[PDB]
Structures are given as C-alpha cells and as structure tokens.
Amino acid sequence: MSKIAALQFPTLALSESRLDYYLKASKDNGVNLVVLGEYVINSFFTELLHMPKNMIKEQSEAKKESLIKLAKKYELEIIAPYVSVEAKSYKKLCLKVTPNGVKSYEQQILMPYEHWNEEKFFSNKTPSELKIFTFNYEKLKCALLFGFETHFDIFWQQIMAKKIDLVIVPSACTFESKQRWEELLKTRAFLNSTSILRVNRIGKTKDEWNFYGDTLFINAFGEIESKLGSEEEMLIIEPKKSDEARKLWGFDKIIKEFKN
Amino acid sequence: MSKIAALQFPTLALSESRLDYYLKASKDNGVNLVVLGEYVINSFFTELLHMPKNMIKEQSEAKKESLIKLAKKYELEIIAPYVSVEAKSYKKLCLKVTPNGVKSYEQQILMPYEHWNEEKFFSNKTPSELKIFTFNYEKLKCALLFGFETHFDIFWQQIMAKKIDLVIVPSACTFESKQRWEELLKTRAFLNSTSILRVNRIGKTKDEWNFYGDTLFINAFGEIESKLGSEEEMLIIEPKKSDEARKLWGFDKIIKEF
C-alpha cells in the first residue's frame, strides 16, 4: 500500500536529529515519500532579506547534505522546497531527494507582491510554455505544484489531461487566508478529480505573520480526508487512484469533446 | 449608477402579478437589469418530464409574452432561463428580454446525469468550441453562464481574457450542494477577478428535492457581499468595476505573458 507522509515544520534546525526521527517514523509506518513545506529548509522569505548571502548558502548546503544522507539512510524520497544560492543569485526550487540522486523542480510562477516579492528576489527561469511537473510514485500518477501556482487554471487543465491521481502542494500560507485556501483547494480537487496534499509551514515572522500550518489531504471528490493543527506534526496519507471519482461527475468526458 | 436586481422565485403561475410588482420596485430603485433563476418561468425539470408539450408550450409562451410587455412597460432588461418548445424538440435557453427585442442564449453544456438528464431531454445545439455569452450593461462588462457551466475552466479563461466585470449565473441548486457551490463561486470570483451574481430558485419538488434559494452576490475579491434566504425575495446590487481587484492580485498580467 502506497503511503505518503507530510511533515509540518518550522524552519529546520541545523542538527538533523529531529528531522532524522520523523524520517524513521515514516519508514516504520510504511512511508516511502516525505513532503516538506515551503521555507522549511531555509528561513522564511522576509527573514532571508535580513540575512547575508553566505549565511543562506551555508543554510541550504548544510541541510541539503542532511537530506541527501538521510534519503540514503532510510531508502525513501524527500520532497523539499530549497533555496539554491549560485554566485549572488537565488533560485527557488523544489528538491526531490532520493537515495540514488537528486532531481529538482524550478518554480515557474513566483509571487510579485511588494511585501512578498519572490519574483524580484529569485532568478528563476521563466519558461515560454508552462508545463506541470509530473512523476510516478509506485502506481500513482503525481504532480508537483507550488502553492502560488495553484491559482492558475492553465496548470489544472494539464493535471486533468494527464489523469493525475495526486497533486503535491508545498506552500507557505498565512492565517488570514485559511478559509480561501480551503475553498480553492477543495474546488480544484472536485473540478479536476484529483487528490491534493497541501503541506504548510508553522511559525511567526519578524512582522508577526502567523503560519498556522493546517496541512491537509483532500481526496478526488473535493472532500477533506486528513487535517493537521498548528503544532509540529506528521500526516500520513493513503492516497487512492482518481478513476472512481472521475466517473462520478465525468467532467473530463464532457471537456474532452470540445475543441478549445 | 448601474444596479441589478435578482428575483428569488419558485415556478411562476399563469396569472401572476408578482413579476409586474417586482419589476416596478426594481425600476423605482434605479435598476435596469433583472435576473431570474432556472425553472422560474417553467416547472422544474423533473416535473417537465410528465408534462405534455402543449402544456409546456402554454407555460413558456405566456411568460415570454408577459416579459416582452413588462420589459416595454418598465423599459428594463430581463434575464430568464426559458424552455423553448420548437416543432420537434425542447430547447433550454436563457432569454435576455429588452424593450427593443428578445435575445436568447442557448446552453452549451447540459447535465447528462441519469436522475437529472437535461442532455437527453433537451435538443440544444452543441458548439464545437465554447464561447462565453457576453453583453455590455451600462458601463459594466457582463457574462452569462448557466449554473452547471461554471464547473469548466474553459469558460473562466475566456471571462478573464475579456476582462469581465460581472458574471451572472442563473441556476437551480439543491441544499445538499450549498457549501460546494459557495466554495466554487468564491474561488471563481477570486481567481478570475470578477463579481458573480448567482440567482437560485426556491421550492420543493415531487421527489422532495429542496431548493434553498440562497441567491448571493460575490465581489471581484472573492467575498460574499449580498445573500438571500430561502423565501421569495429581491436582491439589489451595485456592481463595481473589477479593475482594482485585477490590479491587486494580477492573475491576468501573469497569465497574459504566456
């Protein structure tokens, strides 16, 4: 049975001891894939602004080293948003650390808002065409989407066309958006008949921005199966194939016949 | 200012002064566009299956005449889902009755589910490509969508591209979907930076299907501004232009680059 673990974390300690325990707990429970929230390996975006470039590089390189070692140690995959420091430029990626190597997903759409300007801070390549990041985990068809990227219908049309079973959404969400995020993710899952795993971070920032966590699992019917609180927690999910729920409303069968 | 009225009604009877009275109250308040829900002019869909064509034709033609006369009397526009009885078939349209004539919108995507098989009952034209029905109401850019059609991303992409200010959704929604409909419409208004007016019907059917009404107005930020109850009511809204909300989140500017 294919199980996935989501870790609700604040910014990770430099000592791997606490992360080591959760990976062992996942493996003991039969989990072979672990997901981390945004800005869990690194400090939060606004805290990165008041940090020296070398300190961010040291933070990323040290914890990437722990993830690569721990993936080999427990023979599992780890999904983790990572801030890549090349020279003086920064890239926002999502790492897929595995025992045999590291694959990365470069975020295609970043937040441009002045108070949270990821577009100006990061130097991510903007592709000519948007393409969803997809991978197969055992018998499941999965896709990787960042929290901000879930706001665009163009990504979801690809998820429906590729008949994705589970969409993994690492994010960093603030408590004053709790209801809107629930309504958005439940609607995306119901409309496109796919399960959504949304892993959030916890913690308060220098501007007293509250990260409530609320890591949740939504099934292909648009219903919430699992939920987490505001504390440090681990969520294990048994995701199912979306074939059965797809049949119920048949949105794909209707949409496939048109030529738009 | 540009105001719109939504009337929450059950299936209206043959001799009814309710449309006459509500239109006068709307016009007095400065409303020049009134919206009706699905199956308000007609009997509910499951009731229509056990009705003779002449009986349904009698129902539709009488209300079409009343709307044409009432539109000229009060010099305003009426939006109403209408069951058109043709020579060999029935068609599900949305009428936009005006003082100067009658325009109609033929539903492009119909429900095919066994218990509510509108696709089987109606003979609506199936277009090769979906196109949103758009009209200009005073200074607002408006779109007309049926309740079921709001489930499809293709429509909203067109609504976003045309920088629509208000999307009008006449619908027939039942109480076991109240939460899902709110989550869906609030998400659509937020994501596409458009105000949404969803007008529902009220009443219980022969199968004990409860129509809760709950006609609501959602702004371009994805917030519920106005709402109605389960009884017959009128909702007057003053829609604002979505330029401010579009600039705030900039979903259009980001997608337009691709």
PDB file of N, CA and C in Angstrom, chain A residues 70-164:
ATOM      1  N   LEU A  70      20.205  11.379   4.643  1.00  0.00           N
ATOM      2  CA  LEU A  70      19.064  10.719   5.271  1.00  0.00           C
ATOM      3  C   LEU A  70      18.225   9.946   4.261  1.00  0.00           C
ATOM      4  N   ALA A  71      18.161  10.417   3.014  1.00  0.00           N
ATOM      5  CA  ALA A  71      17.441   9.669   1.988  1.00  0.00           C
ATOM      6  C   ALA A  71      18.098   8.319   1.742  1.00  0.00           C
ATOM      7  N   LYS A  72      19.433   8.288   1.688  1.00  0.00           N
ATOM      8  CA  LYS A  72      20.136   7.019   1.540  1.00  0.00           C
ATOM      9  C   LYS A  72      19.974   6.163   2.788  1.00  0.00           C
ATOM     10  N   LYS A  73      19.957   6.805   3.959  1.00  0.00           N
ATOM     11  CA  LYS A  73      19.903   6.081   5.225  1.00  0.00           C
ATOM     12  C   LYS A  73      18.597   5.307   5.378  1.00  0.00           C
ATOM     13  N   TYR A  74      17.469   5.930   5.043  1.00  0.00           N
ATOM     14  CA  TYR A  74      16.162   5.310   5.199  1.00  0.00           C
ATOM     15  C   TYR A  74      15.559   4.810   3.892  1.00  0.00           C
ATOM     16  N   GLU A  75      16.261   4.965   2.770  1.00  0.00           N
ATOM     17  CA  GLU A  75      15.826   4.428   1.481  1.00  0.00           C
ATOM     18  C   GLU A  75      14.421   4.916   1.129  1.00  0.00           C
ATOM     19  N   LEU A  76      14.254   6.235   1.162  1.00  0.00           N
ATOM     20  CA  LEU A  76      12.992   6.880   0.842  1.00  0.00           C
ATOM     21  C   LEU A  76      13.279   8.155   0.062  1.00  0.00           C
ATOM     22  N   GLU A  77      12.223   8.743  -0.484  1.00  0.00           N
ATOM     23  CA  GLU A  77      12.317  10.005  -1.196  1.00  0.00           C
ATOM     24  C   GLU A  77      11.837  11.143  -0.306  1.00  0.00           C
ATOM     25  N   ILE A  78      12.471  12.303  -0.461  1.00  0.00           N
ATOM     26  CA  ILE A  78      12.113  13.506   0.279  1.00  0.00           C
ATOM     27  C   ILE A  78      11.839  14.611  -0.727  1.00  0.00           C
ATOM     28  N   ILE A  79      10.699  15.277  -0.570  1.00  0.00           N
ATOM     29  CA  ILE A  79      10.318  16.418  -1.392  1.00  0.00           C
ATOM     30  C   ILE A  79      10.456  17.659  -0.523  1.00  0.00           C
ATOM     31  N   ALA A  80      11.294  18.601  -0.950  1.00  0.00           N
ATOM     32  CA  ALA A  80      11.516  19.753  -0.087  1.00  0.00           C
ATOM     33  C   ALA A  80      11.821  21.022  -0.873  1.00  0.00           C
ATOM     34  N   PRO A  81      11.051  22.095  -0.668  1.00  0.00           N
ATOM     35  CA  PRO A  81      11.404  23.387  -1.272  1.00  0.00           C
ATOM     36  C   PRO A  81      12.761  23.868  -0.775  1.00  0.00           C
ATOM     37  N   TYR A  82      13.608  24.273  -1.716  1.00  0.00           N
ATOM     38  CA  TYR A  82      15.011  24.566  -1.460  1.00  0.00           C
ATOM     39  C   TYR A  82      15.382  25.884  -2.119  1.00  0.00           C
ATOM     40  N   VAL A  83      16.140  26.705  -1.403  1.00  0.00           N
ATOM     41  CA  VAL A  83      16.644  27.960  -1.947  1.00  0.00           C
ATOM     42  C   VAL A  83      18.077  27.714  -2.398  1.00  0.00           C
ATOM     43  N   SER A  84      18.283  27.762  -3.718  1.00  0.00           N
ATOM     44  CA  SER A  84      19.569  27.457  -4.331  1.00  0.00           C
ATOM     45  C   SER A  84      20.354  28.752  -4.483  1.00  0.00           C
ATOM     46  N   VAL A  85      21.510  28.830  -3.834  1.00  0.00           N
ATOM     47  CA  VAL A  85      22.369  30.006  -3.910  1.00  0.00           C
ATOM     48  C   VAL A  85      23.520  29.732  -4.875  1.00  0.00           C
ATOM     49  N   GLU A  86      23.426  30.273  -6.089  1.00  0.00           N
ATOM     50  CA  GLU A  86      24.508  30.258  -7.064  1.00  0.00           C
ATOM     51  C   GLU A  86      25.085  31.662  -7.120  1.00  0.00           C
ATOM     52  N   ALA A  87      26.414  31.767  -7.081  1.00  0.00           N
ATOM     53  CA  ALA A  87      27.071  33.069  -7.020  1.00  0.00           C
ATOM     54  C   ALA A  87      26.359  33.983  -6.029  1.00  0.00           C
ATOM     55  N   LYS A  88      25.774  35.066  -6.545  1.00  0.00           N
ATOM     56  CA  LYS A  88      24.994  36.008  -5.756  1.00  0.00           C
ATOM     57  C   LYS A  88      23.513  35.902  -6.084  1.00  0.00           C
ATOM     58  N   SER A  89      23.143  35.055  -7.046  1.00  0.00           N
ATOM     59  CA  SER A  89      21.753  34.936  -7.455  1.00  0.00           C
ATOM     60  C   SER A  89      21.085  33.821  -6.662  1.00  0.00           C
ATOM     61  N   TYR A  90      19.758  33.866  -6.609  1.00  0.00           N
ATOM     62  CA  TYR A  90      18.980  32.863  -5.896  1.00  0.00           C
ATOM     63  C   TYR A  90      17.957  32.209  -6.812  1.00  0.00           C
ATOM     64  N   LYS A  91      17.751  30.909  -6.627  1.00  0.00           N
ATOM     65  CA  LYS A  91      16.705  30.168  -7.319  1.00  0.00           C
ATOM     66  C   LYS A  91      15.828  29.457  -6.299  1.00  0.00           C
ATOM     67  N   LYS A  92      14.519  29.479  -6.539  1.00  0.00           N
ATOM     68  CA  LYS A  92      13.554  28.772  -5.704  1.00  0.00           C
ATOM     69  C   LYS A  92      13.192  27.469  -6.408  1.00  0.00           C
ATOM     70  N   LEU A  93      13.619  26.349  -5.838  1.00  0.00           N
ATOM     71  CA  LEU A  93      13.356  25.054  -6.435  1.00  0.00           C
ATOM     72  C   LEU A  93      12.626  24.185  -5.423  1.00  0.00           C
ATOM     73  N   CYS A  94      12.102  23.064  -5.900  1.00  0.00           N
ATOM     74  CA  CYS A  94      11.587  22.020  -5.022  1.00  0.00           C
ATOM     75  C   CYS A  94      12.424  20.780  -5.290  1.00  0.00           C
ATOM     76  N   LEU A  95      13.185  20.359  -4.290  1.00  0.00           N
ATOM     77  CA  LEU A  95      14.041  19.199  -4.443  1.00  0.00           C
ATOM     78  C   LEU A  95      13.245  17.914  -4.272  1.00  0.00           C
ATOM     79  N   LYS A  96      13.640  16.895  -5.029  1.00  0.00           N
ATOM     80  CA  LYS A  96      13.146  15.530  -4.867  1.00  0.00           C
ATOM     81  C   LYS A  96      14.372  14.673  -4.573  1.00  0.00           C
ATOM     82  N   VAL A  97      14.782  14.662  -3.309  1.00  0.00           N
ATOM     83  CA  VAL A  97      15.972  13.927  -2.902  1.00  0.00           C
ATOM     84  C   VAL A  97      15.620  12.453  -2.768  1.00  0.00           C
ATOM     85  N   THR A  98      16.380  11.603  -3.442  1.00  0.00           N
ATOM     86  CA  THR A  98      16.199  10.160  -3.434  1.00  0.00           C
ATOM     87  C   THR A  98      17.527   9.520  -3.071  1.00  0.00           C
ATOM     88  N   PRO A  99      17.530   8.229  -2.719  1.00  0.00           N
ATOM     89  CA  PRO A  99      18.809   7.577  -2.386  1.00  0.00           C
ATOM     90  C   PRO A  99      19.816   7.569  -3.522  1.00  0.00           C
ATOM     91  N   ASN A 100      19.356   7.513  -4.770  1.00  0.00           N
ATOM     92  CA  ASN A 100      20.237   7.388  -5.922  1.00  0.00           C
ATOM     93  C   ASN A 100      20.587   8.715  -6.590  1.00  0.00           C
ATOM     94  N   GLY A 101      20.018   9.824  -6.139  1.00  0.00           N
ATOM     95  CA  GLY A 101      20.339  11.111  -6.723  1.00  0.00           C
ATOM     96  C   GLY A 101      19.313  12.151  -6.329  1.00  0.00           C
ATOM     97  N   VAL A 102      19.476  13.339  -6.909  1.00  0.00           N
ATOM     98  CA  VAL A 102      18.615  14.477  -6.615  1.00  0.00           C
ATOM     99  C   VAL A 102      18.038  15.035  -7.910  1.00  0.00           C
ATOM    100  N   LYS A 103      16.711  15.134  -7.975  1.00  0.00           N
ATOM    101  CA  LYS A 103      16.002  15.834  -9.036  1.00  0.00           C
ATOM    102  C   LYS A 103      15.383  17.101  -8.458  1.00  0.00           C
ATOM    103  N   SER A 104      15.242  18.131  -9.290  1.00  0.00           N
ATOM    104  CA  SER A 104      14.742  19.418  -8.825  1.00  0.00           C
ATOM    105  C   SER A 104      13.684  19.963  -9.776  1.00  0.00           C
ATOM    106  N   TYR A 105      12.730  20.700  -9.205  1.00  0.00           N
ATOM    107  CA  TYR A 105      11.678  21.382  -9.951  1.00  0.00           C
ATOM    108  C   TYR A 105      11.817  22.880  -9.738  1.00  0.00           C
ATOM    109  N   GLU A 106      11.977  23.621 -10.831  1.00  0.00           N
ATOM    110  CA  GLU A 106      12.122  25.070 -10.774  1.00  0.00           C
ATOM    111  C   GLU A 106      10.745  25.719 -10.849  1.00  0.00           C
ATOM    112  N   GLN A 107      10.394  26.498  -9.823  1.00  0.00           N
ATOM    113  CA  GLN A 107       9.091  27.150  -9.798  1.00  0.00           C
ATOM    114  C   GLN A 107       8.947  28.080 -10.993  1.00  0.00           C
ATOM    115  N   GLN A 108       7.822  27.956 -11.692  1.00  0.00           N
ATOM    116  CA  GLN A 108       7.603  28.717 -12.912  1.00  0.00           C
ATOM    117  C   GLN A 108       6.919  30.054 -12.671  1.00  0.00           C
ATOM    118  N   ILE A 109       6.052  30.149 -11.669  1.00  0.00           N
ATOM    119  CA  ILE A 109       5.343  31.385 -11.362  1.00  0.00           C
ATOM    120  C   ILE A 109       5.606  31.737  -9.902  1.00  0.00           C
ATOM    121  N   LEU A 110       6.173  32.920  -9.674  1.00  0.00           N
ATOM    122  CA  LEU A 110       6.521  33.406  -8.348  1.00  0.00           C
ATOM    123  C   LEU A 110       5.659  34.605  -7.975  1.00  0.00           C
ATOM    124  N   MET A 111       5.560  34.842  -6.674  1.00  0.00           N
ATOM    125  CA  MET A 111       4.746  35.941  -6.165  1.00  0.00           C
ATOM    126  C   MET A 111       5.419  37.275  -6.468  1.00  0.00           C
ATOM    127  N   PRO A 112       4.721  38.222  -7.094  1.00  0.00           N
ATOM    128  CA  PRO A 112       5.317  39.539  -7.392  1.00  0.00           C
ATOM    129  C   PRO A 112       4.895  40.669  -6.458  1.00  0.00           C
ATOM    130  N   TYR A 113       4.185  40.375  -5.374  1.00  0.00           N
ATOM    131  CA  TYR A 113       3.663  41.416  -4.500  1.00  0.00           C
ATOM    132  C   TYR A 113       4.801  42.065  -3.721  1.00  0.00           C
ATOM    133  N   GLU A 114       4.716  43.384  -3.523  1.00  0.00           N
ATOM    134  CA  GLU A 114       5.854  44.121  -2.976  1.00  0.00           C
ATOM    135  C   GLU A 114       6.264  43.598  -1.602  1.00  0.00           C
ATOM    136  N   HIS A 115       5.293  43.311  -0.730  1.00  0.00           N
ATOM    137  CA  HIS A 115       5.625  42.838   0.613  1.00  0.00           C
ATOM    138  C   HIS A 115       6.192  41.423   0.607  1.00  0.00           C
ATOM    139  N   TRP A 116       5.970  40.665  -0.465  1.00  0.00           N
ATOM    140  CA  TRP A 116       6.415  39.282  -0.564  1.00  0.00           C
ATOM    141  C   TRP A 116       6.871  39.036  -2.006  1.00  0.00           C
ATOM    142  N   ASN A 117       7.865  39.819  -2.441  1.00  0.00           N
ATOM    143  CA  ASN A 117       8.284  39.872  -3.846  1.00  0.00           C
ATOM    144  C   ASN A 117       9.289  38.763  -4.142  1.00  0.00           C
ATOM    145  N   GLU A 118       8.758  37.569  -4.410  1.00  0.00           N
ATOM    146  CA  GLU A 118       9.617  36.458  -4.801  1.00  0.00           C
ATOM    147  C   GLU A 118      10.136  36.613  -6.226  1.00  0.00           C
ATOM    148  N   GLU A 119       9.383  37.293  -7.097  1.00  0.00           N
ATOM    149  CA  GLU A 119       9.833  37.481  -8.475  1.00  0.00           C
ATOM    150  C   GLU A 119      11.119  38.297  -8.544  1.00  0.00           C
ATOM    151  N   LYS A 120      11.238  39.333  -7.714  1.00  0.00           N
ATOM    152  CA  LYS A 120      12.436  40.160  -7.766  1.00  0.00           C
ATOM    153  C   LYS A 120      13.601  39.502  -7.039  1.00  0.00           C
ATOM    154  N   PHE A 121      13.322  38.771  -5.957  1.00  0.00           N
ATOM    155  CA  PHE A 121      14.404  38.170  -5.181  1.00  0.00           C
ATOM    156  C   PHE A 121      15.032  36.993  -5.915  1.00  0.00           C
ATOM    157  N   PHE A 122      14.212  36.137  -6.515  1.00  0.00           N
ATOM    158  CA  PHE A 122      14.712  34.938  -7.169  1.00  0.00           C
ATOM    159  C   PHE A 122      15.020  35.203  -8.638  1.00  0.00           C
ATOM    160  N   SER A 123      15.905  34.373  -9.188  1.00  0.00           N
ATOM    161  CA  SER A 123      16.293  34.484 -10.586  1.00  0.00           C
ATOM    162  C   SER A 123      15.872  33.227 -11.337  1.00  0.00           C
ATOM    163  N   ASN A 124      14.631  32.798 -11.124  1.00  0.00           N
ATOM    164  CA  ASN A 124      14.129  31.595 -11.766  1.00  0.00           C
ATOM    165  C   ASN A 124      13.928  31.839 -13.255  1.00  0.00           C
ATOM    166  N   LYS A 125      14.196  30.813 -14.061  1.00  0.00           N
ATOM    167  CA  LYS A 125      13.955  30.927 -15.493  1.00  0.00           C
ATOM    168  C   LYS A 125      12.454  30.896 -15.751  1.00  0.00           C
ATOM    169  N   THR A 126      11.969  31.855 -16.532  1.00  0.00           N
ATOM    170  CA  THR A 126      10.558  31.900 -16.880  1.00  0.00           C
ATOM    171  C   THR A 126      10.375  31.183 -18.210  1.00  0.00           C
ATOM    172  N   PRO A 127       9.714  30.030 -18.243  1.00  0.00           N
ATOM    173  CA  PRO A 127       9.596  29.278 -19.496  1.00  0.00           C
ATOM    174  C   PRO A 127       8.613  29.923 -20.463  1.00  0.00           C
ATOM    175  N   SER A 128       8.819  29.628 -21.750  1.00  0.00           N
ATOM    176  CA  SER A 128       7.892  30.103 -22.774  1.00  0.00           C
ATOM    177  C   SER A 128       6.524  29.445 -22.622  1.00  0.00           C
ATOM    178  N   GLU A 129       6.496  28.159 -22.277  1.00  0.00           N
ATOM    179  CA  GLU A 129       5.257  27.438 -22.028  1.00  0.00           C
ATOM    180  C   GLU A 129       5.296  26.828 -20.636  1.00  0.00           C
ATOM    181  N   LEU A 130       4.175  26.924 -19.930  1.00  0.00           N
ATOM    182  CA  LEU A 130       4.038  26.298 -18.626  1.00  0.00           C
ATOM    183  C   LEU A 130       3.779  24.808 -18.795  1.00  0.00           C
ATOM    184  N   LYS A 131       4.475  23.997 -18.004  1.00  0.00           N
ATOM    185  CA  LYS A 131       4.290  22.553 -18.026  1.00  0.00           C
ATOM    186  C   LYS A 131       4.285  22.041 -16.593  1.00  0.00           C
ATOM    187  N   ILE A 132       3.290  21.219 -16.248  1.00  0.00           N
ATOM    188  CA  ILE A 132       3.217  20.678 -14.896  1.00  0.00           C
ATOM    189  C   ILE A 132       4.333  19.664 -14.691  1.00  0.00           C
ATOM    190  N   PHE A 133       4.890  19.648 -13.480  1.00  0.00           N
ATOM    191  CA  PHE A 133       5.917  18.687 -13.100  1.00  0.00           C
ATOM    192  C   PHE A 133       5.224  17.420 -12.621  1.00  0.00           C
ATOM    193  N   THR A 134       5.452  16.313 -13.320  1.00  0.00           N
ATOM    194  CA  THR A 134       4.787  15.058 -13.011  1.00  0.00           C
ATOM    195  C   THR A 134       5.814  13.968 -12.753  1.00  0.00           C
ATOM    196  N   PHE A 135       5.480  13.081 -11.821  1.00  0.00           N
ATOM    197  CA  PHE A 135       6.295  11.916 -11.532  1.00  0.00           C
ATOM    198  C   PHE A 135       5.358  10.807 -11.091  1.00  0.00           C
ATOM    199  N   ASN A 136       5.828   9.575 -11.222  1.00  0.00           N
ATOM    200  CA  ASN A 136       5.063   8.403 -10.824  1.00  0.00           C
ATOM    201  C   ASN A 136       5.648   7.861  -9.531  1.00  0.00           C
ATOM    202  N   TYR A 137       4.810   7.750  -8.509  1.00  0.00           N
ATOM    203  CA  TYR A 137       5.193   7.180  -7.223  1.00  0.00           C
ATOM    204  C   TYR A 137       4.413   5.883  -7.077  1.00  0.00           C
ATOM    205  N   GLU A 138       5.113   4.765  -7.270  1.00  0.00           N
ATOM    206  CA  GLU A 138       4.523   3.424  -7.281  1.00  0.00           C
ATOM    207  C   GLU A 138       3.455   3.416  -8.369  1.00  0.00           C
ATOM    208  N   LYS A 139       2.199   3.107  -8.072  1.00  0.00           N
ATOM    209  CA  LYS A 139       1.151   3.059  -9.087  1.00  0.00           C
ATOM    210  C   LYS A 139       0.383   4.372  -9.226  1.00  0.00           C
ATOM    211  N   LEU A 140       0.759   5.409  -8.483  1.00  0.00           N
ATOM    212  CA  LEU A 140       0.073   6.692  -8.515  1.00  0.00           C
ATOM    213  C   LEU A 140       0.682   7.601  -9.578  1.00  0.00           C
ATOM    214  N   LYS A 141      -0.169   8.420 -10.198  1.00  0.00           N
ATOM    215  CA  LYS A 141       0.274   9.482 -11.096  1.00  0.00           C
ATOM    216  C   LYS A 141       0.245  10.781 -10.305  1.00  0.00           C
ATOM    217  N   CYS A 142       1.412  11.381 -10.093  1.00  0.00           N
ATOM    218  CA  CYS A 142       1.518  12.555  -9.243  1.00  0.00           C
ATOM    219  C   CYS A 142       2.023  13.765 -10.015  1.00  0.00           C
ATOM    220  N   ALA A 143       1.684  14.938  -9.487  1.00  0.00           N
ATOM    221  CA  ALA A 143       2.159  16.213  -9.994  1.00  0.00           C
ATOM    222  C   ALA A 143       2.627  17.070  -8.824  1.00  0.00           C
ATOM    223  N   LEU A 144       3.586  17.953  -9.094  1.00  0.00           N
ATOM    224  CA  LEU A 144       4.153  18.837  -8.082  1.00  0.00           C
ATOM    225  C   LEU A 144       3.829  20.276  -8.459  1.00  0.00           C
ATOM    226  N   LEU A 145       3.097  20.963  -7.590  1.00  0.00           N
ATOM    227  CA  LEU A 145       2.696  22.344  -7.803  1.00  0.00           C
ATOM    228  C   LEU A 145       3.032  23.160  -6.564  1.00  0.00           C
ATOM    229  N   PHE A 146       3.575  24.354  -6.775  1.00  0.00           N
ATOM    230  CA  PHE A 146       3.802  25.248  -5.655  1.00  0.00           C
ATOM    231  C   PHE A 146       2.490  25.910  -5.253  1.00  0.00           C
ATOM    232  N   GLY A 147       2.458  26.425  -4.023  1.00  0.00           N
ATOM    233  CA  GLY A 147       1.219  26.976  -3.506  1.00  0.00           C
ATOM    234  C   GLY A 147       0.673  28.094  -4.371  1.00  0.00           C
ATOM    235  N   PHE A 148       1.538  29.022  -4.784  1.00  0.00           N
ATOM    236  CA  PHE A 148       1.058  30.143  -5.581  1.00  0.00           C
ATOM    237  C   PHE A 148       0.593  29.692  -6.958  1.00  0.00           C
ATOM    238  N   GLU A 149       1.223  28.656  -7.510  1.00  0.00           N
ATOM    239  CA  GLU A 149       0.902  28.195  -8.853  1.00  0.00           C
ATOM    240  C   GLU A 149      -0.471  27.533  -8.941  1.00  0.00           C
ATOM    241  N   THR A 150      -1.077  27.163  -7.810  1.00  0.00           N
ATOM    242  CA  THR A 150      -2.389  26.527  -7.836  1.00  0.00           C
ATOM    243  C   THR A 150      -3.504  27.494  -8.222  1.00  0.00           C
ATOM    244  N   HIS A 151      -3.210  28.791  -8.309  1.00  0.00           N
ATOM    245  CA  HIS A 151      -4.182  29.833  -8.620  1.00  0.00           C
ATOM    246  C   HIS A 151      -4.477  29.962 -10.105  1.00  0.00           C
ATOM    247  N   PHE A 152      -3.821  29.179 -10.950  1.00  0.00           N
ATOM    248  CA  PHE A 152      -3.886  29.351 -12.393  1.00  0.00           C
ATOM    249  C   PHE A 152      -4.541  28.136 -13.033  1.00  0.00           C
ATOM    250  N   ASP A 153      -5.613  28.375 -13.799  1.00  0.00           N
ATOM    251  CA  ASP A 153      -6.354  27.270 -14.401  1.00  0.00           C
ATOM    252  C   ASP A 153      -5.501  26.497 -15.397  1.00  0.00           C
ATOM    253  N   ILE A 154      -4.514  27.161 -16.004  1.00  0.00           N
ATOM    254  CA  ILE A 154      -3.703  26.538 -17.048  1.00  0.00           C
ATOM    255  C   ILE A 154      -2.993  25.290 -16.524  1.00  0.00           C
ATOM    256  N   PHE A 155      -2.516  25.327 -15.275  1.00  0.00           N
ATOM    257  CA  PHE A 155      -1.883  24.145 -14.692  1.00  0.00           C
ATOM    258  C   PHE A 155      -2.886  23.018 -14.499  1.00  0.00           C
ATOM    259  N   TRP A 156      -4.089  23.350 -14.035  1.00  0.00           N
ATOM    260  CA  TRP A 156      -5.065  22.322 -13.700  1.00  0.00           C
ATOM    261  C   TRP A 156      -5.597  21.611 -14.935  1.00  0.00           C
ATOM    262  N   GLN A 157      -5.705  22.315 -16.062  1.00  0.00           N
ATOM    263  CA  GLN A 157      -6.108  21.661 -17.302  1.00  0.00           C
ATOM    264  C   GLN A 157      -5.128  20.552 -17.678  1.00  0.00           C
ATOM    265  N   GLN A 158      -3.828  20.783 -17.465  1.00  0.00           N
ATOM    266  CA  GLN A 158      -2.835  19.741 -17.717  1.00  0.00           C
ATOM    267  C   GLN A 158      -2.983  18.579 -16.740  1.00  0.00           C
ATOM    268  N   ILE A 159      -3.288  18.871 -15.474  1.00  0.00           N
ATOM    269  CA  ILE A 159      -3.471  17.810 -14.485  1.00  0.00           C
ATOM    270  C   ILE A 159      -4.641  16.913 -14.877  1.00  0.00           C
ATOM    271  N   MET A 160      -5.731  17.511 -15.363  1.00  0.00           N
ATOM    272  CA  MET A 160      -6.870  16.720 -15.818  1.00  0.00           C
ATOM    273  C   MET A 160      -6.522  15.908 -17.060  1.00  0.00           C
ATOM    274  N   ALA A 161      -5.810  16.517 -18.011  1.00  0.00           N
ATOM    275  CA  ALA A 161      -5.476  15.817 -19.247  1.00  0.00           C
ATOM    276  C   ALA A 161      -4.556  14.633 -18.981  1.00  0.00           C
ATOM    277  N   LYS A 162      -3.627  14.778 -18.038  1.00  0.00           N
ATOM    278  CA  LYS A 162      -2.690  13.707 -17.725  1.00  0.00           C
ATOM    279  C   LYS A 162      -3.263  12.701 -16.731  1.00  0.00           C
ATOM    280  N   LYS A 163      -4.515  12.885 -16.306  1.00  0.00           N
ATOM    281  CA  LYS A 163      -5.210  11.968 -15.401  1.00  0.00           C
ATOM    282  C   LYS A 163      -4.407  11.733 -14.122  1.00  0.00           C
ATOM    283  N   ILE A 164      -3.969  12.839 -13.518  1.00  0.00           N
ATOM    284  CA  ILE A 164      -3.166  12.794 -12.303  1.00  0.00           C
ATOM    285  C   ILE A 164      -3.998  12.279 -11.135  1.00  0.00           C
TER     286      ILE A 164
END
